[PDB]
C-alpha cells in the first residue's frame, strides 16, 4: 500500500499492480486527422470519455478503493461531490461490491443525482454549497468510520490515473510530448511520474485554464496556494488549491506549462467533434487547447503529440454557448446594415438580388419616414472571399450597405437588439409566419406577401435550417394573429 | 450474387455472405438508462455512430462492391454524394483496393470534400446541384464503364444493411420491436427482411420524418411516388420518392410505420446525448423519435425496444438550433416583465431582490420618462415550482411583473428585439463590459456600477456559465467606450 | 421453454436465446493446410477444444440449466457421469450459481473427480459401474428434487448445442458440407436442425464409429435401438442407444451417414496434431476420420469441408496407443532380420555398414553356434525408397537379410518377443548401459565395446531420441552388473 | 536502432517500441490448477505455443527484420535453420512483406521443409548437415547481400523476446519468479532485462537442460564457452555456445539457475498436458521442470510463480517416448513372474482369479516341462496399495508369484523381450486373435478358446483400450492362421 510521498520506482510498481480493469477499459489512442493535416504534426487523442463514466476518473477511484482494508472496506466510503468524480466512487464501490456515500449539495440538478445513484452510489442531499456538503461528508467520516475517497490528492489515486500513460506508451511508443489537463494535479502526477519512468525523453506538459490555473499559481511560489477566484466554466477543473502530493509530483517530473482562455478551449470542442466526433466537456479539451497554442509558441513541426479528452460530461444546452464563441472567430456570415427607400416592394427587391442565398438575419424597425434600415445577416461557405462579393454585387446594385461582419458589438450584442419601439406609435397589427427553410425560401415569402402592406416590423433570426420563423407588422404558408400580443406591448410597442 | 427481386431465404443467404466485416464493425447495442425509466420499457439503442464513417452506409457499400466482377472492379465505382453515402462508399474502396470516383456539387463545403478524400475516394466537383452532380457520374458511368454505386435501391445494398439486425438478434434475442429510420429505404429493407427470416414474431416499424415521407406516400398509394417537396433538416432521409426494391420488401415486411415532426427528433436528439452521450444527427436520432411517439399511442409498456441510431454527422454549429427547439419545450428559464421607476438605483435594487440567482436576460431601452420596463430571464432548475417562487417574491417585494414564460412570442422572436431606438434622441455614451459569471454576478456588476449614471439602455444576454457581457449607455471589470458604434448608430441611436 | 418435439423454427428461435456465452465462448475456425493441400478441399476445423472443459458439452448444459425455474434452481442439478458431460455441467452450475452434484462409480480416477470438482461440481462416489451411479443420480432426483440434467436427450440441450453451428455458418458462410460426430445425437440434432433453418443446401453428415453406431443402427430399423455392444476406445461416442428427440432430428434433417473404424480414428488424432497442433480425444477427432472418408468415396475436390473437433479430453499415456496404431500404416522404419556369423565382432562389422543412421531395434538370443540372427529396426525418413536403398547397401556388402517391414506379425507382435531363452543354459553375465543418442550412436558404443568379448544376449530397442539403453549378456558409457537379475532368471536365462 | 551493447533503458525502450503485434499476439497465462494445489504454490504457465508459429521465436524475429533499413529489406534475409527459428522468420517476412530465403540441409524432413514454405519463406536445401547448411547461408549473404537474422545473439532479437515479459508483468503484476528455458540465450536476457528495469524484486531464474547447459558452462568460466556435446532431446535449446551479448545480459540481470534431466522434462510434459491441456516440446516444458526442482530445492511455498511454455512444436510420435519414461516414475501396473503348472486349463485358472482387471502383458514361451512361467502385467488405478492387493489375492489363491513391479530390467528392457525359441523343437501351429478390449476380456477369450489345445506360446500387449490382440501358438473373435510366418520362423521356431 502506497503511503506519503513514494519514490519514482514506487509509483511505477503500484500503476503496474492497480486492478483498474476490473472497473475501467482501454481507451482508443486516435489520430486527429484534419487537425494534424492543419498544424503539420501528428496528433493523437486519447480518449477517456469511452469509459463508462465518461471521464478518466474511475481510474484513481477503483485503485485507491481497492486498495483498501477488509475493515475499511466493511465500513464504507464516502465523498462529497456532484460531477465526474461522484460518478467514478459510486461505479468503482459497485464493482468492488462496497458501500459509497455521495454527499451533494441539496440544490444539485436531478440528473445528476440519479447519475451517480444510476451508476450505484447511495446520494444524500445536504448543504447550501459544496464546501456545506464536504464539511457533512467529512463529519460522517468521523461518526461512521466511512474511508474518504479524494479526487486527486492521493498516491493511490495518482497511480491510478498513471495507467492511463501505460496505456499510452504501449498505444503509440513514439511520442514526442503528452499534454494533460491539469485540475487539482492528479492526473498530471499519475501521467507523468509513470512516463518519466518507463520513456523519460517523453515531455510531458501541464495546461491549465487561465482563470483556474492553481498549479501555475503554485509552482510561481513554490508550494501550493489558494486561488482567490476559479472561473467555473470548466467545471472538472475548477480546484482553488492544487493537491500537496500532485504538486510534489508536478514540480518534479513536468517538463511546461501553459494556459489558454475560455474561447481557446471552445475551439478545441468545435475540433474534438469535428475530427472524431467526440464531445468533449471544456475541462476535456483543455489539453488540446493548450497543444495547439504550444504548437504555435515553439513552432513544432513533424513530431507526435498526444492530448487526452478528460471527459464528455457537459449538459447538451451547454453546446450553444460554445457554438456562440466559436463563431466570433470564424466567418460563416456576413452582416449588414442595408438603408433602403420606404417604399411598398423595397424589402422584396432587396431579397430578389440576394437571390437563392441563406439569409440569417433580416430585422426591421420602422424609424425614418424616408429610409429604412435593415440589419441582414447571409451565411457564408467561402469567408472573406464570399463577403466582398455579396458586398459588390449589393453595391452594383444600387444598395446603400455598411459591413458590420467585423463589428465587434454587432456581433456580441446588436444582433440580440434590432427592434424596439417606433419613433411615434403606429396603428399596426402583427402576424407570425413560418414556411420550409431553403435556399430563397425567404424570398418566395415576400414575394408571396406582396406589396400591398406597410411593413412597419420585420424579424427573422435562421440558422439556414428546418423551417423559417418571421415576425411582422403591418401599418394599416402558415400564419398566425399576434396582434396585442403581451410581450409586444411591452417592449416593441409605440 | 443477388438480382432483381430475391426470395427472403435469398436474402438472409446474402446476409450471411456479405463480407462487411472486411470494413464494418460490430457495433454496441446500448441501453438507455433514463428514459427506459421514464417511458417504462427497456429501450436499446443500437449505435451505428460508432462505425469509422459514423454511419450504417459502409456496410451496403462494402457488400454491393465486394459482389462486383473483377472486370467490373478493375472498371472502379463511382456515386454522386456529399454526405453518408460518399463517406461509405470512399471507406469502402479503399478497403476493397478499387477506384472510386465521387461527383458533388462545386459548392459542397470543403470539409465535407476532405472526408471523402480522407477515405479514400476520389473527388470530382462537378454541378450547381445535386442533380447536375449525379447527371455527371451517369455520364461517366456510360463514357469511362464505372459501376455506378446506389444509396439503397439494390438487393446488395439491402443485403449488407441487413447484416446489422444480424447483429441485432443476437446482441438480444429477447427484443419486441425495432424502429428504423426511412430515406429510400434500404436499412429498413434490410433490417425488415432479414428479422422476418430469422424472429418473425419480432415487430418491425419503419419512421419517416413527416416532411420526407415518402415511403407513407408509396404505401398509401401502392407503390413509389414522387414527394414534391422535401424537407431538409434530416439529410439522410431527404429523398424524394421510395426504391422499386426497397419499397417491395417494406411492403411485405414492414409491421407499422409512424412519422414526426422535427422539434420530435430534436428532443430524441437531446436524449441520445443525455442517456449515452452520443451525438446523432437528425437522420440518426428519427427511429428514437418514432419509438417514443409510437410508445404513447399504443400505451406499450414492460418490451424491450430497440431503434438504429444511424448516423453522426452533422455540423457542431448544427446543435445550437436543436438545443433552441429543445428549450422551447422545456421550463428551463423564467422570462419577465418588470416595469420598475425610472430612478437612478431601480435596476440594482430589483436585482437584489433575484439575489443568487442566474440572471439569462436583462434587457431594457428607454422609453417613457417615468417607468422602465425590463425584459427579465432567470434560469430555472425545478420549472414551474421554481417559477411562481420567484413570481411571488416579486410580488411580495412590491414589483409589478408580467409572466412571459408562457408567451411564444417572447421565447421566439421578441427576446431576440428588446432594445431598438428612443423615443427621441438623447445624449449618451456607450460602454461594454465583462465580469466573470456566477450567481449574483450581475447584482455584483450593478452594485460596483452605482447609482451615478442615468441607464438609458441594457443588453445582458447569458448562458449563464464563463463571461457575463453587458452593454449599457449612459445619459450625461473590463470595460471599453463603444460610443458611437456603427451598429449602434444605425439601429440603436435615437 | 422448449418442450416435447418443437418446430424448426422454434429450435432457430431457442438457439438465438441460448445463453450460452455466460460459460462458453466463440471457438476459432481454422484451415487445416497441410490436409487441404493432400485432399484438394478447402479442410476447416471448429476447435470446441478451446472451451473452458475442452469440449462443447458446457453448451447445452448451460442452455439446459439456465433455462430451468427459479424453484428448480433452488433445489439443484444433479446428473451421472465422469466424463466430459460432467465437466459440463459442473462448470455451467459454477457460472449460474446452482448446486450441482455429479454422481460417479467408486472406482472413478481421482483426476476425473478432482477435474469435475475444480470445475464447481459436488461430487458423490456411487456405485460399481455408471449404471449404479445413474440409478443413484435418479433416486436423488426423486428423492431430493434435483432437476436430472440429460447428455444429450432434451430439446434445450440440442439448442444449445446448436449454437456453434450458429458461429460456424457466420465464420464461414461459404461451407458445403459439414461433419459431425455422433453420440445419442445431441450435438448432430442441433447442428443439423440450426443449419437447416438457415442454410439449408449445406449437407450435414453425421460420423459414427462402427462399433459405436447407435444412429445407423436406429435409422436402419427406423426407431431408437439398443446396441448389444459398444466399443470403449472413443468414450464420448460410446452411447448404446440415440436419443428419442436426438433421433427425430437426425432422421428429419441430416443428409448422409457414415462410419469409421479405430485405425482410421488414429490417424485423424495425427492429423489435427500435425496441421493444428492440437490433440483431440477420438471421439473428438471422429468427424474428421469421417470426412477423410467421405472424401475418397465420392471423389469430393474444391469444396469447402468442416468437421467439429469436439472434445480433448485424453488421458496422456494414451497417445501411446494411437501413436502405436499410426505407425502401423506408415513407413517409417525398416525391420530385418539379419543372419551373421557367430564370430566375435559380426555385431560390429554389421553396424559399421548401417553408418550414421538411427537404429530403432538390435535384438538377438544365442541359438546356433553358426550363425547369429539380429533383429534390426531402421529409422526411415524417405519410406520404402529409403527401405530399398538399405536392402540393397546390405546386399552388395554380402548380408543375408530377409525383409521383414511389412510382415503384419513382426510389425504388431515379434517385435516384443525377441529374446526368451538360449538353446542350452551358458555362462553368461548381464550388463546394462547407456549412452547419449544420435545417429551412429550405436555403431560407436559396439565400436567401443569391441570383440573381446563373445556377446549371449543383445536388446536395444529405441525411439532414435535422447538416450539409448542398451541390455547385454556375455559369455565366460554408464554401465551396471544386472547379472542374476530376477527378470533374467525366470525368462531368459537357459 | 540498437546496436551493439545497450544499457537497460535502452532495451526497455526498445522492447516498447518493438512492433511485434503486426505478427505474433499477446498470449495467455494460465494457473496451473492441479500442480498449484500439489506444490503450494501459484503456478502460472505463458502460453507461447499460441503464437501463429507456436513458439515465441517470431517475436524476435519481427523485432529485428522490422528494425532493418529499406535497403536491407529490399535485398532480402536469410537465416539457417529447419526449427522453430525458420518458421518465425518466414511467417515474420510474410507478415512485414520481404523476401527470406531459409537453408536447411539436403535430409530435413519434408514436414519440417512444407511448414516454413507454408509460412511463407523461400527454403534452400543444402548440405549433409547444419553446420554446412549455415556456411551456404553466410556465403549467400555476402554474394547476394541478404542481412542474416540471428536465433539470439542480437539486441533486436532480444528486444523482441523481452516483449513477453511486458505482457508478464501486466497480465500478473503480483508475480514473485519467472523461470525461463536457455537455448543460446535471447529469451532469457530480453526476459530478465525488461523484468529488471520494471519490477526488479522479481527474481528471473534460468532453466537448462544439463546435457545443454552452455549458460551454466559460461558461468562458471566467466565468458561464452564451447560445449563438447549437446544432448539431442530437447532440440530448441540444443545449442553448444551461449551468444555473446546474451551473456552480457544473463550474467548481469539472472538471479539464478537450475539445471534438470531428460526424465524430469518428460515429467513437466506430462504435467503440463493434464493441467491445461498443452502439449510442449520438450524446450517448452523445460522451465517448468526446472521451477519443480526449484520449489523443492529451496522450499517455497505460497508464492506466485511463472514458466514460459516456449513452443510446441514436437512430432506426434515423440510423445510415444515421453510418455514411456513418465511410465517408469508412475505405479500404474503390476509386473509378475507367475510361476503355474504347464497342465492345460492353467492360464485360464488363474485369469479367472484376475478377474474384471485390464491385463496389460500376458507373455509365455514353453520351456520346462513342469511349470510354465508367465510374465504378467496389470493396470492399475490406487498404485501400490492396489499392487498389494493383486499380490495377496494371488497368494491366497496358491500360486507362486514373484513381484517384479519394481524390477529396473523388467521395466525397461525384458517387458520386451519375453519369448523367443523353445527349449527344444515343437511341432505346432501359429494364430493371431483380436476381441474387442474391456476388463476381463482376455479372461473370456481364453474362456472361449477352452482347454483341447495345450499352449506353448503367448504373446499379448495392451494398453487396456480399443483391440486385444493375442499371437498363440499351439502344439499338435477374428482368428487368422500365422503358421511358418517369416518372423517366427528367424525368432520364435525351435
Chains 1, 2, 3, 4 share one sequence.
Not at 260 to 285: H, N, Q, T, W, Y
Amino acid at each position: 500500500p502506497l503511503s506519503g510521498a513514494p519514490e519514482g520506482a514506487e509509483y511505477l510498481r503500484a500503476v503496474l499492480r492497480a486492478p483498474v480493469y476490473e472497473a475501467a477499459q482501454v481507451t482508443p489512442l486516435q489520430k486527429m486527422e484534419k487537425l494534424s493535416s492543419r498544424l503539420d504534426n501528428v496528433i493523437l487523442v486519447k480518449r477517456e470519455d469511452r469509459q463508462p463514466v465518461h471521464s478518466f476518473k474511475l481510474r484513481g477511484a477503483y485503485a485507491m478503493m481497492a486498495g483498501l482494508t477488509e475493515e475499511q472496506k466493511a465500513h464504507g466510503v464516502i465523498t462529497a461531490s456532484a460531477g465526474n468524480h461522484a460518478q467514478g466512487v459510486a461505479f468503482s464501490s459497485a464493482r468492488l461490491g462496497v458501500k459509497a456515500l455521495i454527499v451533494m449539495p441539496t440544490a444539485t440538478a436531478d440528473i445528476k443525482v440519479d447519475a451517480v445513484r444510476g451508476f450505484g452510489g447511495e446520494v444524500l442531499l445536504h448543504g447550501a454549497n459544496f464546501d456545506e456538503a464536504k464539511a457533512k461528508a467529512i463529519e460522517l467520516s468521523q461518526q461512521q468510520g466511512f474511508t474518504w475517497v479524494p479526487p486527486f490528492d492521493h498516491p493511490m489515486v495518482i497511480a491510478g490515473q498513471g495507467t492511463l500513460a501505460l496505456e499510452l506508451l504501449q498505444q503509440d511508443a513514439h511520442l514526442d510530448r503528452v499534454f494533460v489537463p491539469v485540475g487539482g494535479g492528479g492526473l498530471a502526477a499519475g501521467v507523468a511520474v509513470l512516463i518519466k519512468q518507463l520513456m523519460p525523453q517523453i515531455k510531458v506538459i501541464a495546461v491549465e485554464a487561465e482563470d483556474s490555473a492553481c498549479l501555475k499559481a503554485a509552482l510561481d511560489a513554490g508550494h501550493p496556494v489558494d486561488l482567490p477566484r476559479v472561473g467555473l466554466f470548466a467545471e472538472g477543473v475548477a480546484v482553488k488549491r492544487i493537491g500537496d502530493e500532485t504538486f510534489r509530483l508536478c514540480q518534479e517530473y513536468l517538463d511546461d506549462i501553459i494556459t489558454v482562455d475560455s474561447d481557446a478551449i471552445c475551439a478545441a470542442m468545435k475540433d474534438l467533434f469535428e475530427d472524431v466526433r467526440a464531445v468533449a466537456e471544456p475541462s476535456g479539451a483543455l489539453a488540446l487547447a493548450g497543444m495547439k497554442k504550444y504548437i504555435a509558441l515553439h513552432n513544432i513541426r513533424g513530431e507526435r503529440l498526444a492530448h487526452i479528452l478528460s471527459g464528455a460530461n457537459v449538459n447538451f444546452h451547454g453546446l450553444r454557448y460554445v457554438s456562440e464563441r466559436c463563431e466570433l472567430g470564424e466567418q460563416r456570415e456576413a452582416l449588414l446594415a442595408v438603408t433602403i427607400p420606404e417604399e411598398k416592394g423595397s424589402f422584396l427587391k432587396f431579397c430578389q438580388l440576394l437571390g437563392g442565398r441563406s439569409v440569417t438575419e433580416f430585422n426591421y424597425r420602422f424609424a425614418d419616414a424616408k429610409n429604412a434600415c435593415i440589419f441582414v445577416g447571409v451565411r457564408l461557405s467561402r469567408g472573406l472571399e464570399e463577403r466582398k462579393e455579396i458586398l459588390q454585387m449589393l453595391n452594383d446594385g444600387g444598395y446603400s450597405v455598411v459591413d458590420l461582419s467585423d463589428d465587434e458589438m454587432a456581433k456580441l450584442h446588436v444582433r440580440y437588439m434590432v427592434g424596439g419601439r417606433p419613433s411615434h406609435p403606429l396603428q399596426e397589427r402583427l402576424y407570425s409566419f413560418e414556411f420550409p427553410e431553403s435556399p430563397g425560401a425567404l424570398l418566395r415569402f415576400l414575394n408571396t406577401l406582396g406589396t400591398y402592406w406597410n411593413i412597419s416590423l420585420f424579424h427573422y433570426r435562421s440558422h439556414g435550417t428546418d423551417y423559417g420563423r418571421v415576425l411582422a407588422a403591418f401599418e394599416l404558408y402558415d400564419c398566425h394573429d399576434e396582434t396585442n400580443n403581451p410581450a409586444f406591448r411591452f417592449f416593441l410597442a409605440g
